[PDB]
Symmetry: D2
Subunit: 106 residues, 4 copies
């Protein structure tokens, strides 16, 4: 979609995970989160509406999204294990990845 | 795309890599594969069309893609490292994931 | 302990997963493979005795163990979920990393 | 190495990264973080002396080191690629994993 939906989607589901009662929601929340980051891998962002698809600023923008998927893929294992709290921890801990990309690219 | 389209995409570029002279042909191919990977797991493979989206078979089907997506990423760092060769052997190596998913869920 | 020593615990603990009946044994093998891969990452292989600790191939050699390690890490998460079948097929996929390394430096 | 040593190595090798001129410094600083993180996996901590080797606290304590390696594993390719700025950024991102373990386990 629009990058902003994806981002809102990511963000919404973060709060959802912050607030979530159990594994059930965390699981779908992360399922939701992962499709969107994946959907965002391909977009050419406002700040980099300039340079071409293969350059050290459109590669490193894109690499930030694999950091993100792996960390979603970890929490989802934790969310699967019946370990809500330690999976909600992992969800909090991707805010650091959210911010790093943001700092160079937003 | 639907599942089949992504799967040709995955196979066409796995071919590209095998013949690629240089790192740039590898990077672009592996870039196409990643999106094809993350598009593909939103699909319901015929073999499991019956089963519910939330189901052991179907959560494992989706998990296979993270494994492919992690691999392409690493393979893509080796493509950004100028190391033309080891990226191909890394890509070849991921045929194992392809085969494993196909051995169970095709 | 040393390389030839470490590889047997890998080779042996690989064998214990292939036949296992419950999680604990698999969880149990997987963590020694990691220690065995913790222990083995530091060492120097007979094919690279001449090479400096900052050589390309020694870096490419330590790399193999991370891939192997990264797979063990995920393979442990499925065991933790009790998914015995999946954890046996995941451990099976490790041979691809085992074999990738041996072509080059064993 | 022991836990206190391994931590010292992590903390100093990071600070080396923060202050780095080049890429081969960061390459070498991260490698010693990886050696130390590998090595701390087998240590049992002052908060969990009372806890058993295969237990929820110790399995999840060893998992903290599995995360960190991956971020360390990933930090090297940026560095390897002469990508100093963004390798340092991946080193600042380790602090979220650093902190995560301490809150739960120090
Ligand atoms: C780069 C690789 C990013 C990662 C990883 C994440 N975000 Fe993002 N985000 C990114 C950009 C370039 C932008 C700007 C889009 C724009 O409006 O021009 C954003 C934006 C947001 C927003 C605000 C959207 C808006 O309407 O302005 C939010 C709320 C947001 N991002 C949240 C968010 C969260 C929670 C993330 C991790 C879970 C995350 N982002 C990752 C780039 C990147
Ligand atoms: C599951 C997690 C899969 C992974 C990983 C890969 N593939 Fe796949 N592939 C998968 C399914 C379920 C199917 C069947 C599609 C159908 O409905 O018929 C396929 C199919 C293919 C095909 C042929 C498509 C067809 O006509 O049926 C090809 C050429 C193919 N897959 C290639 C391929 C490659 C190269 C992969 C890794 C790089 C790969 N697949 C991974 C499921 C999964
Ligand atoms: C490099 C990154 C490696 C990975 C990953 C694995 N192995 Fe290995 N192995 C490696 C080297 C360099 C050597 C030779 C070193 C020496 O001096 O012995 C080996 C050797 C073995 C052997 C031979 C032991 C013997 O009978 O003499 C075995 C059986 C072996 N390796 C098994 C093995 C398995 C099962 C792995 C994955 C699970 C694996 N190795 C990974 C280098 C690397
Ligand atoms: C668990 C998975 C950990 C990770 C990841 C990191 N650290 Fe750690 N650290 C951990 C424990 C259990 C302890 C206390 C152990 C003890 O016996 O003291 C520590 C301690 C430290 C210290 C303090 C040294 C002291 O005065 O006792 C420092 C400075 C430290 N840790 C730094 C550090 C850094 C920089 C890390 C990431 C880059 C990091 N730690 C990760 C457990 C874990
Ligand atoms: Ca077809
Ligand atoms: Ca098409
Ligand atoms: Ca000491
Ligand atoms: Zn994990
Ligand atoms: Zn089509
Ligand atoms: Zn079609
Ligand atoms: Zn069509
Ligand atoms: Zn085609
Ligand atoms: Zn790598
Ligand atoms: Zn011996
Ligand atoms: Zn996994
Ligand atoms: Zn030690
Ligand atoms: Zn990366």
């Amino acid at each position: 979609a629009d990058l902003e939906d994806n981002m809102e989607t990511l963000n919404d589901n973060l709060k959802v995970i912050e607030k979530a009662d159990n594994a059930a929601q965390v699981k779908d929340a992360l399922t939701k989160m992962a499709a969107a980051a994946c959907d965002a891998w391909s977009a050419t962002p406002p700040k980099l509406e300039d340079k071409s698809p293969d350059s050290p600023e459109m590669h490193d923008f894109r690499h930030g999204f694999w950091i993100l998927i792996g960390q979603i893929h970890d929490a989802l294992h934790l969310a699967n294990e019946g370990k809500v709290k330690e999976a909600q921890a992992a969800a909090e801990q991707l805010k650091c990845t959210c911010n790093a990309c943001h700092q160079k690219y937003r």
